[PDB]
Design a binder for this molecule. Structure first.
Ligand SMILES: Nc1ncnc2c1ncn2[C@@H]1O[C@H](COP(=O)(O)OP(=O)(O)O)[C@@H](O)[C@H]1O
Ligand SMILES: Nc1ncnc2c1ncn2[C@@H]1O[C@H](COP(=O)(O)OP(=O)(O)O)[C@@H](O)[C@H]1O
Ligand SMILES: Cc1cn([C@H]2C[C@H](O)[C@@H](COP(=O)(O)O)O2)c(=O)[nH]c1=O
Ligand SMILES: Cc1cn([C@H]2C[C@H](O)[C@@H](COP(=O)(O)O)O2)c(=O)[nH]c1=O
Ligand SMILES: [Mg+2]
Ligand SMILES: [Mg+2]
Ligand SMILES: [Mg+2]
Ligand SMILES: [Mg+2]
Ligand SMILES: [Mg+2]
Lengths: 209, 209
């Protein structure tokens, strides 16, 4: 009985990391075997290059950094398929959708070109998109020193996320991330319990193919 | 008057490196501004990962290593376009075609998926493919300790190279690399002088788009 692959995507400060942590804690307390993953995975050789880039400690050519983000997913694919086949549900904080949206927000990058490197990745059984109005995101923090920490760029990435959501091949669910941390958690956890039960019924899919 | 982008591809031991070196030497002695490039470019952070992989000092997941090879090309794109626009002809020892053929030779990799990451790269004005029968390649050396150093795998990559050569968008020229080093050089140098003259007439193209 395979585990489900559940991805959290969403606007800045909507709570992807907070909710992915709480979801894994809650699923394990309810008897599930569940583990947390995130992308970028900064612990690998490629992950260190990406971390330096995002921190602005280094500059990387836009196409090159897009492919490194994708490669950083591919290198975890053997582990992801092993865990899922062992019945472990994986809760992932960002995935290929962030990959496509963030490069897709840059000038002269088509969504098609941006998608290709990730075609074939393990297909999420559930993609949660945490929505939050900017007035509410503004009370949760201030723009940082990191790469992409600006409103004009996050808006362009948001348009790309909406283009991706038109893809009916994927089990997208919108989450109203403006509620309390607990209320949002409950919405996500109930959606996750449903997906976990149905994932044991269909083989793990392939993304965008 | 832009420089030309000339790529050398070919079967193992056909003489890509020998001929790319001699071509750059000959073009500069004939008054051209010409420089040598090669892929993988092992000097960068990504290039070091690729070098370790090819030397079998490390293992890399097949998709991940394919994207790193492509990224290693992208990171040199700003330099390539700068040199070409300055009138410098660039002679390159392997390019995206090797990228697609070598991953394409592995099981479960379509030529389509393999091509995507390199779509958009600076398009070669001339792609030379050095052909050599295996009996003749056999007298030029013995299989090494490196990755891909085996006949069954080189044969699969060779089929992929022939699929790529069906692409009429590209100025492919076959070279009979079985002749002497000097005779092959002369064949390549005359083809290169012709391409250099015509490249000053059309803008640098984009590969596979
Ligand atoms: N529903 C929520 N209500 C109020 N604050 C929240 C909520 N979700 C997250 N936060 C706070 O907002 C900040 C951003 O949360 P985080 O999970 O790191 O977001 P993301 O990973 O989407 O950037 C954190 O300080 C977190 O405590
Ligand atoms: N035309 C040729 N005739 C005879 N030996 C050659 C010829 N071209 C290359 N060689 C030798 O064969 C070997 C492989 O050449 P090299 O240029 O390194 O090939 P490649 O880069 O295609 O693997 C080298 O020792 C080189 O000196
Ligand atoms: C996974 C992923 C993240 N990103 C970005 C989004 C964030 O700006 C950044 C750090 O992620 P975080 O907000 O999850 O800490 O990485 C990409 O640009 N491409 C990718 O493939
Ligand atoms: C450029 C390139 C080379 N290769 C391989 C072909 C050779 O086996 C190897 C070393 O190159 P070399 O024979 O030019 O020294 O790298 C790939 O697998 N992918 C690539 O994108
Ligand atoms: Mg986060
Ligand atoms: Mg396509
Ligand atoms: Mg951040
Ligand atoms: Mg060589
Ligand atoms: Mg070698």
């Amino acid at each position: 009985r395979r585990g489900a692959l559940i991805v959290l995507e969403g606007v800045d400060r909507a709570g992807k990391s907070t909710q992915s942590r709480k979801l894994v804690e809650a699923l394990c307390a309810a008897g599930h075997r569940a583990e947390l993953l995130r992308f970028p995975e900064r612990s690998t050789e490629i992950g260190k290059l990406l971390s330096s880039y995002l921190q602005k400690k280094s500059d990387v050519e836009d196409h090159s950094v897009h492919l490194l983000f994708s490669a950083n997913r591919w290198e975890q694919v053997p582990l992801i398929k092993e865990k899922l086949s062992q019945g472990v549900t994986l809760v992932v904080d960002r995935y290929a959708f962030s990959g496509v949206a963030f490069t897709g927000a840059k000038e002269n990058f088509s969504l098609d070109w941006c998608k290709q490197p990730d075609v074939g990745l393990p297909k999420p059984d559930l993609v949660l998109f945490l929505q939050l109005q900017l007035a509410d995101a503004a009370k949760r923090g201030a723009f940082g020193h990191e790469r992409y920490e600006n409103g004009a760029f996050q808006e362009r990435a948001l348009r790309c996320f909406h283009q991706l959501m038109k893809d009916t091949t994927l089990n997208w669910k919108m989450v109203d991330a403006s509620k309390s941390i607990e209320a949002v958690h409950e919405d996500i956890r109930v959606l996750s319990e449903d997906a976990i039960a149905t994932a044991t019924e269909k083989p793990l899919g392939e993304l965008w193919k």
